[PDB]
Symmetry: D2
């Protein structure tokens, strides 16, 4: 063929309110940041030893809007976007961010969250 | 005591042979780079186009090894790892890479895929 | 292709309290039934129509227990088991049930309150 | 309280030709049967036993067609449908089949390369 399967699945809480914004063509684009966590106590020296990944998801169109009107910090959502590392040059050098992009092929859904 | 679900699923072809290591000379860590692709005929030229994401997957333990013994450039694998963006300071500033880490909760599997008969 | 990938992912609510069982082996086996839902509109025969699949998940070992101690009707869990249609002859004919089996390769996790 | 996430992911080989049908008036419906496998040696016998699940996937629209035109037996596909147990009364009693339904939210893709 010439395609493959690039899929990301997430169940997490927004760590910050939806970071909305618009662009050319007049685009709706939410930038929520999810946080998954995985703990595993045993053999160390003190207290606690948890780890929590922070995903940089990226919504578009409706979802973007939806996110904006109803998503809040603490909420718990299920994302089915896809990996998309994007290059951008900072105030000098080139930086790239891998973000969770939910475009059609996937979709957000929230739970009872908090 | 937080958890949630951080899962990545990939079906793709390695774009470069597998980068394998062993620490402590057995904590094997493979670093294969997958490539997924998504085309479409560009409408304004009518020509063919194709953007292709390159994922940086990371295998461990057995899979790492497995990858090493049987995973070659162009091979097609199914990974079920999880997202793990990790921070590292370059030769000056701080950089972070989001890699596909396959640790237990997931696992690699290859298809007959493309480009075989290695050792002509 | 020689082994393939059989994976099921679910986010749903138990429709009834668990159903723990202990087999000779000594293991515990929870049989919670999840319910996913998908509503939608039309123009043929219906209003805002909603159909809801009922998955028959199957837990083992710890999870089975966990489920038992803290899973009740209405809880919301994330299962990562695998499809497993199993044949069994009823009080006469042969019947087969496709159940969501979570064995190692996957795992349960609940939303809103947990092992806490 | 009217959703959740019901998703099935499969990478497998059709165990035989895709049963391709074109509904009463138009849209088709493919009925390919996937086969996943899981082996292991016997902790005593040493035999290389292997259990293999057979999924009953269901394609629609394009995919259905695609399947028909290019999915040959033995083909290896990736399905991203969702679980859908459906009730039907046999030539007497009530029977229910849990099938892998690929409707929009998912999609078929075959492997090959050679």
């Amino acid at each position: 063929a010439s395609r493959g399967v690039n899929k990301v699945i997430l169940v997490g809480n927004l760590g910050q309110d939806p970071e909305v914004r618009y662009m050319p063509n007049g685009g709706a684009v939410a930038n929520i940041t999810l946080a998954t966590s995985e703990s595993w106590r045993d053999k160390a020296t003190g207290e606690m030893k948890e780890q929590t990944e922070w995903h940089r998801v990226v919504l578009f169109g409706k979802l973007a809007e939806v996110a904006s009107e109803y998503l809040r910090k603490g909420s718990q959502v299920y994302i089915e976007g896809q990996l998309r590392t994007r290059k951008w040059t900072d105030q000098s050098g080139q930086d790239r961010y891998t973000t969770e992009v939910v475009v059609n092929v996937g979709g957000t859904m929230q739970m009872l969250g908090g």
